[PDB]
Structure 1
Amino acid sequence: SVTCPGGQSTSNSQCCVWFDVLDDLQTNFYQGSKCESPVRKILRIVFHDAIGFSPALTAAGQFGGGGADGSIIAHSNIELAFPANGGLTDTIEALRAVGINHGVSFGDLIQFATAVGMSNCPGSPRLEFLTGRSNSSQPSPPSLIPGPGNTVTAILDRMGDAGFSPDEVVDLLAAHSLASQEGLNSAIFRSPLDSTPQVFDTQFYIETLLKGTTQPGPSLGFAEELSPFPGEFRMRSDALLARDSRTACRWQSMTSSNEVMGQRYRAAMAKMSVLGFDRNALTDCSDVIPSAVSNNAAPVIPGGLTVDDIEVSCPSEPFPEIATASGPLPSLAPAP
């Protein structure tokens, strides 16, 4: 039955080329299956590629975007001039060469490199992987990517038009548990957004809820807020979504269980991966994606801070009992 040339077993013949681009990506792009900047840049790329999809523009007679079509690569010349797409050129070129070398569509390649990159980071779920997205695309319309200075109403409207409920917006943001910034405050290049930029865990939701106390760099960058300890960066949209009444209870529910956060994120990502497509027209090659090593650490409020330091914002659910750590306040090293 379907055995690929390397001897692995798969559900369908269309999955066999993906074992070759898996080896190439792990050896080259990911520098030996690491969870470092290439993974974090691909997570920004999959979001910026898939979110260029607007039913409302379609409704007004305009081209609304093809969704998860690989247009950020095929039309990088126009899409990388967009405000939200800075610091992506080097990663886009590396992906372009891999797609051209293996003959796979750009939209599929981005979805595949996201599932593979996440499997290198401890604690990650196994993301679904579908193949078959057409390689033909048109440039994404401008202004469809949420920005860090946007209000929560603006973010929810944009994300809602794409098809996500407020809960799913919070779920999608679990990707900032493997994140840093490079272009908002370049004076503190690669300052992490949570204390474990290499572990897919709940720390991001916990730490954005702590009182902003520290300015991590010499001045404040675009859309920068005070953070809870040296080296951590906090952006305004994350601070505001953590505290807004429309998203606060879902944000709070993501703090205590890595297992719940991961299933929620996996479901929201599978929805995002087929924006602009019919998933029933695609082939499932999820079995090509390897398992990530498990994360054995429990959620904690870092460095001696307690529940008295988190600004509880969900009025109906008491904040979950999370462990405390005995120590001085941490100072975070740049994300690798």
Structure 2
Amino acid sequence: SGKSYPTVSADYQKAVEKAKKKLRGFIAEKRCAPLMLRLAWHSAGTFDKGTKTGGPFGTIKHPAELAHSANNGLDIAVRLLEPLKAEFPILSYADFYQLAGVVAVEVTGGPEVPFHPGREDKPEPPPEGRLPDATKGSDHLRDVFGKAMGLTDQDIVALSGGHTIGAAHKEASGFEGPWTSNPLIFDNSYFTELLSGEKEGLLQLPSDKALLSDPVFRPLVDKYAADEDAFFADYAEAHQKLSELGFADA
């Protein structure tokens, strides 16, 4: 992994464990798992490996970053978490948001993504424009996930599977509707829907469709559609990597 995780105090570790439980209950009750996953992903996805800037360091709560067009509708997520965060003053926002992402996947029935504490809250949000454009294709996905974040082609396909929960909103991105018939259930249905073609009532972004036509991405879509266990394994790996971009050296 190339990771050396920092030491945190026993009190910090206790807070992580307690916050994890409180997050399960809150996220399940509020039905906001997909929104919390999006919040964690948009926090982390700004990492640029060349300059070591952006990444999961608490900056998404900053008015300046929330205002990024890619982040439309995430102000809600930040507000929803503020009362719970206030119960855990010892935790960084950085850790709290990544923990919420991990919990979002868990409570919707997804894999248990390993979590290591210690991210510091950094003062400077990254510049706008690093998050992917839903209207573009495979070259663009590699620029963003590969050239900037430093994730693999496998990670790209697995992480796209995060769309197995949630929906787009015409008031946020402009796109509208869920990718799956069960948007609060984490499973491999995203890939199965991708393969079956356009079904009325279900969403496919151009960026999703790009996975089907790329020589490297397509076999991965096929694998995940055929084998949910393989999806969960590769997803857990990718999510952990994403949640740790720029953190614990690397």
Matched, 1:165 2:152: yes
More helix by share: 2
Cα offset for 1:139?
A: 0.7
Aligned to 2:3: none
What SS is found at the alignment partner of 1:148? coil
Q: Is the 8 Å Cα contact of residues 29 and 94 (structure 1) preserved in structure 2? A: no
Equivalent residue for 1:72, pick from 60, 79, 82: 60
Cα offset for 1:23?
A: 4.2
Matched, 1:182 2:169: yes
Structure 1's 126 and 197: CA in aligned 2 closer, same or farther, altered over 3 A?
same
Equivalent residue for 2:227, pick from 239, 257, 266: 257
| Alignment TM-score, normalising by the size of structure 2 | 0.87
Aligned to 1:147: 133
Q: What letter corresponds to residue 21 of structure 1 in structure 2? A: A
Matched, 1:55 2:49: yes
Gaps of 5+ in 1: 1-11, 59-63, 212-226, 281-336
Structure 1's 85 and 186: CA in aligned 2 closer, same or farther, altered over 3 A?
closer
CA distance in 2, matches of 1:278, 1:159: 19
Cα offset for 1:237?
A: 0.8
Matched, 1:39 2:33: yes
CA distance in 2, matches of 1:185, 1:239: 21
CA distance in 2, matches of 1:188, 1:49: 21
Deviations 1:158-178 (A, max 9, x none): 111211121210011121111
CA distance in 2, matches of 1:88, 1:254: 29
CA distance in 2, matches of 1:193, 1:100: 33
Cα offset for 1:272?
A: 0.9
Structure 1's 278 and 18: CA in aligned 2 closer, same or farther, altered over 3 A?
closer
Q: Is the 8 Å Cα contact of residues 66 and 137 (structure 1) preserved in structure 2? A: no
Aligned to 1:317: none
Within a 5 Å distance, the mapping from 1:1-336 to structure 2 comes to 13-31=11-29, 36=31, 38-56=32-50, 58=51, 65-73=53-61, 75=62, 77-103=63-89, 104-122=91-109, 124-161=110-147, 162-183=149-170, 191-211=177-197, 227-228=198-199, 230-278=200-248
CA distance in 2, matches of 1:118, 1:279: 25
CA distance in 2, matches of 1:186, 1:69: 24
Q: Is the 8 Å Cα contact of residues 44 and 243 (structure 2) preserved in structure 1? A: yes
Please provide the CA RMSD for this pair: 2.4
CA distance in 2, matches of 1:96, 1:174: 28
Gaps of 5+ in 2: 1-9
Q: Give the total of aligned pairs.
A: 240
Fraction of identical pairs, as percent: 25
Aligned to 1:284: none
More relative contact order, 1 or 2 (CA 8 Å, 6+ apart): 2
